[PDB]
A paper describes a structure:
Here, we reveal the extended and contracted atomic structures of an intact contractile-tailed phage (φCD508) that binds to and penetrates the protective S-layer of the Gram-positive human pathogen Clostridioides difficile. The virion can be divided into five distinct regions: the head, neck, tail, baseplate, and needle. Structures of purified φCD508 virions in both extended and contracted conformations were determined by single-particle EM of frozen-hydrated samples; the resolution ranged from 2.6 to 4.0 Å for the extended phage, and 2.9 to 4.2 Å for the contracted form.
Contraction of φCD508 in urea reduces the tail length by just 20%, whereas most CIS tails that have been described contract to ∼50% of their extended length; the outer diameter of the sheath increases from 230 to 250 Å, and the inner diameter from 78 to 94 Å, sufficient to break contacts between gp55 sheath domain I helices and the tail tube gp56. The contracted sheath retains the arrangement of gp55 subunits in a six-stranded helix, but with a decrease in helical rise from 39 Å to 32 Å, and a concomitant increase in twist from 19 to 34°. The measured 20% reduction (48 nm) in tail length is consistent with a decrease in helical rise from 39 Å to 32 Å for 57 rings of sheath protein. The contraction-induced movement of the gp55 sheath proteins can be modeled as a rigid body pivoting motion about domain I. The overall RMSD between sheath protein monomers in the extended and contracted form is 0.63 Å, confirming a rigid body movement of these proteins. In both the extended and the contracted form, the sheath ring retains integrity through its mesh network, similar to the sheath of other CISs. In helical reconstructions of the contracted tail, the tail tube cannot be resolved because of a mismatch between the helical parameters of the sheath and the tail tube. As the tail tube does not contract, the resulting mismatch in length drives the tail tube through the bottom of the baseplate. Furthermore, the X-loop blocks complete contraction of the tail for φCD508; we modeled the φCD508 sheath proteins into a more contracted conformation, based on pyocin trunk structures, but increased contraction of φCD508 sheath proteins led to steric clashes between the X-loop and the neighboring N-terminal linker, as well as domain II of a neighboring sheath. In the contracted phage tail, which lacks the packing interactions between the tail tube and the sheath, the bending stiffness (persistence length) is also significantly reduced.
Author numbering:
A (entry chain S): 13 to 472
B (entry chain M): 317 to 472
C (entry chain L): 13 to 79
């Protein structure tokens, strides 16, 4: 640059930061409003969810999004599910100067929907040629504007202000004629999003979700069986492909605790978590899958350095309600069920559906926190792939560098206290059999536990 | 001193996109195809069209880096032609000088770590049959490999 | 395989082992329940015996198996 003393101030995020959030979650959702056919990330502010997908609790989108956000996920990734017939609302405007009136402007909702987004056009009381363009939803006004009677400036203004973000205006003809007055005319022709949604839509959503990486998946708070087996196979495929995705599920409200335990027996992969209990938060019930959304969100928000075995929930009630016998039955079945151990609703344990089996996949694998730990180690290691694969020569120096980097990572874990003991070394047994263009290595560790049970004995 | 089997590319998208079955099919066919192993576009492997065949032209010949190495050795050697052809007398001294120069070159390669092991010597089998105005020589080497595959096993 | 860094975790029997057992024994048995006409090996967990030959002490099978 030219000589001088040029300041560039950067008080962007000086101390406007907090560290109370973590994790990311996947969400196929049915929605009346918002983008369609894309996987969109949502920051934890619910205002973003409300803006980008509406505020209708009749739909899985807003309700499950609110539950996930209250789960304190750092970034919530959504995908709007639709049938192919799903459509945008639309309205058309016409001129009045000519006896044979001609359509000159068309209004269409910015996102596909079927809501009663309405529009009003009336004569401007100040200027003769101006028309006052006002927009509503069921007469609840969104935005008002006034432009002279030329179509180009009218559509440009209507598309300019983001107060009119609900609707897009397009020019039908290049007229300079006075528009026709409308009063609360709905943008018709749209279709909602709950229309004929089937397993194929969920399959397409999952195929879209293959692109990204996630900490957990919950399947739209829907307990349809065939979707559950499909997602089970999909997660197994993703695991075999090096994508370590965890899955939470919730049974149907009609299922008895015996049926829920049978389903939790049917699932035995460690990445499957079955939720049995229903709950109420704002005096409104939530099916086991709807609360499975929340428990998955809370789990991913916990991340490492935590668990869920007694994490307090937002729910004001829980049902069905279990004695210690029923709780033990559910845990032995691998079911996760909420509890009312105190005046609040409390998560009973960290169990997953796998826990029915014991020894080879160890008992700690029956707990979700260990699976999150293993998936995190696999993810960081598969991040190291690109640092080390195809970039170092397999000699003693390259092996030493790889081992030193992994040792530094595990020592960082040790510094956090997550691991009580570890060692990482070359797998000389397999390294002897290794081909010259490959490397084998081994590591042992001991994750630091957490009190689930405590016992006290008193003397007087 | 490098390869392409995981070199990051500048490309923001790649198509057509392949499962591991398709990738294995392409590699067995000798095809080179880009991949989206992460958020970027990444080169899958070092393979060439030859790789369909295996043993005589060895499996390392199926990889482009080995061919680049062999071509470089041939090029430097065919650079040495002008230094040695028609300029030294084929006696024991000339043969020793040629062998010493080639040994120095291969030791320079060893210093760079590209070669893990080598030996270079007169091809006494063909040198016995060699005409008086020519020279035969032999060399073995071991190019240093690179991790393409890595496997880890965990204990808790 | 294709190039990559593919983990395969093997926390099967990390430290879930003990050395308090040895030996093998033959047993012709009368039983109300279980397989017939085959020589079946039973691991020392009595639950395996109970599953594969019942839990009736009236028969040589369960009683002598427990012993």
């Amino acid at each position: 640059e030219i000589p001088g003393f040029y300041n560039r101030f950067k008080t962007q995020a000086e101390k406007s930061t907090n560290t109370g959030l973590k994790g990311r979650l996947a969400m196929p959702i049915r929605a009346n409003w918002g983008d369609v056919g894309k996987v969109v990330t949502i920051k934890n502010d619910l205002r973003q969810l409300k803006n980008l997908f509406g505020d209708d609790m009749n739909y899985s989108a807003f309700k499950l999004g609110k539950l996930a956000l209250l789960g304190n996920v750092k970034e919530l990734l959504l995908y709007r599910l639709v049938d192919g017939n799903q459509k945008k609302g639309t309205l058309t405007l016409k001129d009045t100067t000519e006896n044979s009136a001609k359509d000159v402007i068309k209004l269409e909702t910015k996102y596909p929907t079927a809501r009663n987004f309405n529009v009003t056009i009336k004569s401007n009381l100040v200027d003769s040629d101006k028309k006052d363009f006002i927009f509503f939803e069921n007469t609840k006004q969104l935005f008002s504007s006034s432009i002279k009677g030329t179509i180009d400036e009218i559509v440009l203004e209507i598309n300019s202000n983001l107060d009119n973000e609900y609707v897009i205006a397009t020019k039908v003809a290049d007229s300079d004629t006075i528009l026709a007055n409308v009063v609360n005319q709905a943008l018709e022709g749209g279709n909602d999003g709950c229309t004929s949604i089937t397993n194929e839509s969920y399959l397409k959503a999952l195929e879209e979700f293959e692109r990204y990486s996630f900490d957990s998946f919950v399947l739209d708070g829907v307990a349809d069986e065939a979707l559950q087996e499909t997602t089970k196979a999909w997660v197994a495929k993703n695991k075999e492909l090096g994508k370590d995705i965890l899955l939470f599920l919730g049974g149907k409200t009609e299922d008895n605790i015996k049926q829920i335990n049978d389903k939790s027996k049917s699932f035995n992969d460690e990445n499957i978590v079955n939720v049995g209990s229903s709950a109420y938060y704002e005096n409104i019930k939530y099916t086991p899958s709807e609360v499975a959304v929340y428990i998955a969100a809370l789990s991913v928000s916990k991340g490492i350095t935590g668990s869920i075995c007694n994490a307090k929930t937002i729910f004001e009630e829980v049902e069905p309600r279990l004695s210690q016998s029923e709780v033990k039955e559910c845990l032995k079945s691998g079911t996760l069920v909420l509890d009312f151990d105190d005046g609040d609703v409390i998560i009973v344990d960290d169990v997953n559906t796998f826990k029915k089996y014991v020894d080879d996949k160890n008992e700690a694998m029956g707990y979700i926190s260990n699976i999150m730990f293993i998936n995190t180690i696999n993810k960081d290691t598969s991040l190291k792939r690109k640092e080390f694969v195809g970039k170092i020569f397999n000699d003693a120096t390259g092996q030493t560098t790889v081992i030193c980097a992994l040792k530094k990572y595990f020592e960082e874990l040790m510094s956090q206290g997550i691991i009580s003991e570890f060692n990482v070394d070359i797998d000389t047994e397999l390294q002897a059999t290794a081909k010259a263009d490959e490397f084998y290595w081994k590591w042992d560790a001991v994750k630091v536990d957490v009190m689930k049970k405590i016992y006290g004995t008193g003397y007087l």
